[PDB]
Design a protein around this ligand. Structure first.
Ligand SMILES: [Cl-]
Length: 247
């Protein structure tokens, strides 16, 4: 990985030593990026609903994961399940349980630094994984991208700034998420997010990552070319808000 400090360095240390699981996948790969385009074709707002109990940005919500997932199955284009344990209070068991109960695509959201975590994702039922440019070297990103693709996943490559974007396009990422915060400060910077979205080629599937969201913000981002929205806080606090955001 790359040089890091603060809590990011700690979480990467944890990921490096995270033990791999042995498990049989129970369902085929359901492609998240392909379902997004199908939603786009029919002009249905495509929202990836995040399940996470905690976040360093202050989220703290206890909520039945199955009740949430089965609700979201009726409206969301996919689910993102955070499996980082120390700062997001996620677990592999939660991913496995949700993956065995819904039939929409599942993004495993963690700090992936080694191939065995992608094995974990596949074995537990995820349909794709998140890769973060800021914690990986370019050569690591390229290797893990190819590794994920060998399983038939197209990973979501998460970018924060223009240097991230250059790396992402150089390695051939086809599915790119754009952050609205930066990791170290946590400060929201929506101007930078809109700036980056406009620099991405139109044939890349683009995902805007948001905590709090409103319909007018969604509409503006869609006009700028965003294909889908990865939304956490608004929906963890108020699942039913997804109806307003779509209609
Ligand atoms: Cl973000």
């Amino acid at each position: 990985p790359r040089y890091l400090k603060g809590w990011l360095e700690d979480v990467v240390q944890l990921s490096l030593r995270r033990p791999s699981v042995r498990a049989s996948r129970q369902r085929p790969i359901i492609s998240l990026n392909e379902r997004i385009l199908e939603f786009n074709k029919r002009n249905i707002t495509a929202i990836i609903a995040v399940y996470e109990r905690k976040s360093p940005s202050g989220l703290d919500v206890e909520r039945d994961p199955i009740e949430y997932a089965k609700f979201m199955e009726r409206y969301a284009v996919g689910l993102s399940i955070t499996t980082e344990e120390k700062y997001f209070n996620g677990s592999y068991e939660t991913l496995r349980k949700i993956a065995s109960s819904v039939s929409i695509p599942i993004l495993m959201s963690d700090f992936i630094v080694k191939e065995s975590q992608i094995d974990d994702a596949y074995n537990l039922g995820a349909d794709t994984v998140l890769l973060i440019v800021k914690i990986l070297t370019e050569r690591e990103l390229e290797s893990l991208l190819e590794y994920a693709r060998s399983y038939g996943m197209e990973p979501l490559i998460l970018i924060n700034d223009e240097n991230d974007l250059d790396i992402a396009l150089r390695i051939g990422a086809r599915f790119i998420g754009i952050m609205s915060r930066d990791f170290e400060t946590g400060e929201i910077n929506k101007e930078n997010q809109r700036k980056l979205i406009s620099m991405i080629p139109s044939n890349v599937v683009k995902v805007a990552k948001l905590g709090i969201s409103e319909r007018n913000e969604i509409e503006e981002l869609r006009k700028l070319g965003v294909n889908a929205f990865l939304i956490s806080s608004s929906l963890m606090r108020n699942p039913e808000k997804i109806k307003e955001l779509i209609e």
